[PDB]
Amino acid sequence: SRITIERDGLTLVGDREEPFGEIYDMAILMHGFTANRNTPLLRQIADNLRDENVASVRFDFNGHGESDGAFEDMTVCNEIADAQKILEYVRTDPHVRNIFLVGHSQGGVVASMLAGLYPDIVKKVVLLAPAAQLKDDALNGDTATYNPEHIPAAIPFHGKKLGGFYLRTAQVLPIYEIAKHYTNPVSIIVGSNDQVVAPKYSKKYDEVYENSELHMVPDADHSFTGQYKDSAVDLTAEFLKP
Amino acid sequence: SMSRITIERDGLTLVGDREEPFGEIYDMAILMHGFTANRNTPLLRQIADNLRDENVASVRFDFNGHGESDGAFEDMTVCNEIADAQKILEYVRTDPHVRNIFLVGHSQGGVVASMLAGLYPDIVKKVVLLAPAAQLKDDALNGLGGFYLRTAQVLPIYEIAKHYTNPVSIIVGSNDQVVAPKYSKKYDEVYENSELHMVPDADHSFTGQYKDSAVDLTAEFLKP
């Protein structure tokens, strides 16, 4: 069912899904850039988790979906703050037992960074085509292009203006630095035909994590479109089966 | 003239004091306080006036969870205070009355200023750091919200800060018992264009006569 939480005066909208029972593990499900908390990928994860007794939360990040905040005011850092506030509401739920994180694309960056900040609280992590390229995209100019040494107050996209503060913080994000601090198990799932995030980024998480595995879905794209969604849902509920 | 201005940041209202010299065009300094303080301590209130009298305008805001500004102190982090200062920077950036933008930060607001300049080294033209609390990172690593402490342990203070290569002045009191003087020296060393000014016998808050010496050194660096 439907829940809301506040972070710095903005409201975040999410959906909560529960299995039969008073106590259960709980996964926090994080989407990617310009996406929402109702992509097919995340809902099928929420349904399949529920069938193996894993509750789950999935929220619209600030500036996305039904949550508050202009798109051009989002950064990966206030998204990390969004996730800290979902983590805390989950952490105070008397029905939650263990806490898992599940992020796709830019949400996988968020998940891995919250995990390195909370390595003692988060017991398993699933990164789904995590988008660490965004730091290298910000440093280069193309994410079309711009000038990475004089970045404007916003760069036009599809109507949703991308804030210049996202880019400047994207360039200096300590993505792998913070994530290596998490030594509990990590499953990384990537598609063999992902044209959005090159292989190196996932292969780099696998080599930096101390307790990780890197699955590859043949022929799968960045989004895990259609049939590819099943192989990514299967792997993710595999990893999280209690 | 002096003004009260408000500002929004993710739906939280931040509360500031704008002080200007009489004219249509001038430089301006953003002045940021430290943890537990507010925009209107004697030291920041003094730097504002001395600057007003050098044709250097100034705004000073209460950080989120501080003074009059919105938000709880437990929800404060060094990252959301950067995001406060960024919103103020955008504000200042968008005044046709502003020529050059300087940053000034005491204690924790000095870490914030060093990090906002490291992100905006094309826009920020001059920085003055008074007793920068870069030690908060090492305090958090050895042993106020839990989120403040978890991010403080992994803050890349010097590594962002160093991308700023315009002139920066670092003024510490020599008898600081809050932040080791060792943190003002790593700043002056990693900065490609900086200067160290130690005020003998001054404490971390630069009180009494030491406030006057701190605002002299501050104002004479930002002086045009």
Numbering used by the authors:
A (entry chain A): 2 to 144, 147 to 245
B (entry chain B): 0 to 142, 165 to 245
Quoted from the paper:
Feruloyl esterases (FAEs, E.C. 3.1.1.73), a subfamily of carboxylic acid esterases, are mainly associated with the release and exploitation of HCAs from plant cell walls. In this study, we aimed to obtain and characterize a feruloyl esterase (LaFae) from Lactobacillus acidophilus. To further investigate the active site configuration of LaFae, crystal structures of unliganded and ethyl ferulate-bound LaFae were determined at 2.3 and 2.19 Å resolutions, respectively. Seven α-helices surround the β-sheets and form a core domain that contains an active site with conserved catalytic triad residues (Ser106, Asp197 and His225).
The crystal of unliganded LaFae belongs to the space group of P212121 with two molecules in the asymmetric unit. The crystal structure of LaFae contains nine α helices and eight β strands. The β1 and β2 strands form an antiparallel β-sheet while the β3–β8 strands form parallel β-sheets. The α5- and α6-helices form a cap domain (from Ala133 to Val175). These structural features showed a canonical α/β fold of esterases. In the LaFae crystal structure, the α3, α4, α6 and α7 helices, as well as the β1-β2 hairpin, are involved in the dimerization interface. Several hydrogen bonds (Asp9-Leu11, Asp94-Lys86 and Leu118-Arg171) and salt bridges (Arg8-Asp9, Asp74-Lys86, Asp121-Arg171 and Asp121-His153) were observed at the dimerization interface; however, hydrophobic interactions (Ile81, Ala82, Leu118, Phe168, Val175, Leu176, Pro177 and Ile181) were predominant during the dimerization of LaFae. The substrate binding pocket is comprised of the β3-α1 loop, β7-α8 loop and β8-α9 loop regions. In addition, the cap domain was observed to be located above the ligand-binding site and this domain was hypothesized to have a gatekeeper role for substrate binding and release of the reaction product. Structural analysis shows that a Phe34 residue, located at the active site entrance, acts as a gatekeeper residue and controls substrate binding.
